[PDB]
Amino acid sequence: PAAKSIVTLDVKPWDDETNLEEMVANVKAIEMEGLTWGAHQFIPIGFGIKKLQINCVVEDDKVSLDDLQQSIEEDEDHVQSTDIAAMQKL
Amino acid sequence: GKEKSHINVVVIGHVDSGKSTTTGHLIYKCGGIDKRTIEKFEKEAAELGKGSFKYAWVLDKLKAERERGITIDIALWKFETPKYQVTVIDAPGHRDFIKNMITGTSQADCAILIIAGGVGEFEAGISKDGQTREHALLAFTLGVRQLIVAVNKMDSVKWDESRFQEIVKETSNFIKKVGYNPKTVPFVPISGWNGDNMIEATTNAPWYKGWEKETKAGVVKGKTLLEAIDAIEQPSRPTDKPLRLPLQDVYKIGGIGTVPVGRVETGVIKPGMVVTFAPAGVTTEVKSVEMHHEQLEQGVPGDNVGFNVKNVSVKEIRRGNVCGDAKNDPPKGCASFNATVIVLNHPGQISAGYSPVLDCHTAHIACRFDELLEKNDRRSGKKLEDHPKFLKSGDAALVKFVPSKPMCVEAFSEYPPLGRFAVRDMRQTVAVGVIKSVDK
Ligand SMILES: [Mg+2]
Known part of the structure; x- marks a missing residue:
């Protein structure tokens, strides 16, 4: 089988009013060969702002995380930035 | 337990x-x-x-x-x-x-x-x-x-x-x-x-x-x-070192104002402290600090905190800037910095003038390899030659870097999290650097 990694991405909104359900729907609509979306939660970070914390499993040789982050960030209407919360080998 | x-x-x-x-x-x-x-x-x-x-x-x-x-x-x-x-x-x-x-x-x-x-x-x-x-x-x-x-x-x-x-x-x-x-x-x-x-x-x-x-x-x-x-x-954790808090994001919250967010790398942040943001040099008072659901008395090394400051627009501070204490070695932008670079395996050679993107703490800025000052024995640090003409995979070298945009970095010996960086190119990290001196 192909080498894989499980990654947890933090996707940050613009403010406390950003439509979070739309934000995660847009992330999950991203389709890449070797990318599998997993569980997610909206986590408070203070002052009423919540970040999206979502898991994904990627085939190392097929999915560029740099590219995935860049793609998510194209949703400028909802996304301010993305960061890797944690990542592990599977 | x-x-x-x-x-x-x-x-x-x-x-x-x-x-x-x-x-x-x-x-x-x-x-x-x-x-x-x-x-x-x-x-x-x-x-x-x-x-x-x-x-x-x-x-x-x-x-x-x-x-x-x-x-x-x-x-x-x-x-x-x-x-x-x-x-x-x-x-x-x-x-x-x-x-x-x-x-x-x-x-x-x-x-x-x-x-x-x-x-x-x-x-x-x-x-x-x-x-x-x-x-x-x-x-x-x-x-x-x-x-x-x-x-x-x-x-x-x-x-x-x-x-x-x-x-x-x-x-x-x-x-x-x-x-x-x-x-x-x-x-x-x-x-x-x-x-x-x-x-x-x-x-x-x-x-x-x-x-x-x-x-x-x-x-x-x-x-x-x-x-x-x-x-x-x-x-030993950096609790008593001066505050260094690289920004990850900056929010504008209705009824609250400016809220930068980032990880406290060194020192401690507390409501009531007067902080400075670098490369810009803006100074202000910390109004309150929050983390997850709790309001904090202090954010210590490792805490990813949000904090509210007044009279700072979200437009004047941004991701990559560094927040520190105005009364304890405040952070400063730099004109250049010299670092020991270890070249990883990659399909290329590095010459003076090379200007790839460097990722240091939360900053992402292209920096020129302005001068290759020395080539060194990696493990001992001994100088092997002055002014090598190029670097290849495996080499350890002292390089003078000039950032293309205002940037706040630190010597690794003083503030570790702001003194190590990754050099990106060819869809990979091609080198790792440890900062040795900064011209603030
Ligand atoms: Mg295996």
Whole structure:
């Protein structure tokens, strides 16, 4: 089988009013060969702002995380930035 | 249930080393990650016979469940030892993990190198061009000075003493070339699958007297891998150092105002302090600090905090800027900085003028390799030549960097998290740098 990694991405909104359900729907609509979306939660970070914390499993040789982050960030209407919360080998 | 100190550990090794089962075993039996999934499979295991099950079998099913994307827990894994709460990373083989290992949060206090004991697996794992050596080199370069070696798959070589001894000899050579002193490294023979010497001592090796390591105060000994981990030395945290807090994001909240967010890397942030943001040089008072759901009296090294400041627009401070204390070595933008660069394996050569993007703390800025000042022996730091004309894979060199945009960095000796960086090019990290001087 192909080498894989499980990654947890933090996707940050613009403010406390950003439509979070739309934000995660847009992330999950991203389709890449070797990318599998997993569980997610909206986590408070203070002052009423919540970040999206979502898991994904990627085939190392097929999915560029740099590219995935860049793609998510194209949703400028909802996304301010993305960061890797944690990542592990599977 | 005793109060614990916190440490970070990174587990590295070749694809056949069995390091994921080994790390998985520790988390399973000493932590609480995806326990509902673990429980589902422990019950299901009754189907294999009359009830008995091997932890490795459950780990295998947990892995498949994770691959389906239906497990609940995030990828931040932890487990406990008698003294510590350990945050562990089973290093990914993903190439984008290299940058994350260099600039990500939670740098390791100890690396655990898992070695397959088998005949063709051991050799494959110590190749000079392998991912394992690169990870070991990166850890060494970043200051991870503690190392533990676990020789896995001992069952496959029938727990033969000679084989273990030869592996220890060869692995000592391997790590010495990277830079580690083998005398300070415990070598533990284990079976990640069967559990030998993981949490309990093995009964398959009467010759085994335990592992040992030299420390500054004496010799520490033990039998298991868990004991080796518990023996990791307590590192000193930067609580009393001046505040350094690289910004990750900046929000404009109605009724509150400006709220920068970032990780406290050194020092402590408190409401009432007067802070400065660099490269811009804006100064202001911290109104309140929040983390997760709690309002804080202080955010300490490691806390990812939000804080509210007045008379700073979100337009004047941004991701990459650094927040510090105006009355205790305030951070400053720099005109240039000199750093020791270790060139990783990549399809190219570096000449003065090269200007790739550098990732340092939360900053992402192209910086020119303005001058190649020296080439050095990597392990000792001895100068080999002045003004090398180019750098190739493997070289260690002192380079003068000039940032293309205002940038705040620090010497690694003073503020570690703001003094290490990754150099990006050709879809990979091509070099790692440690800052030695800054022209503020
Ligand atoms: Mg494997």
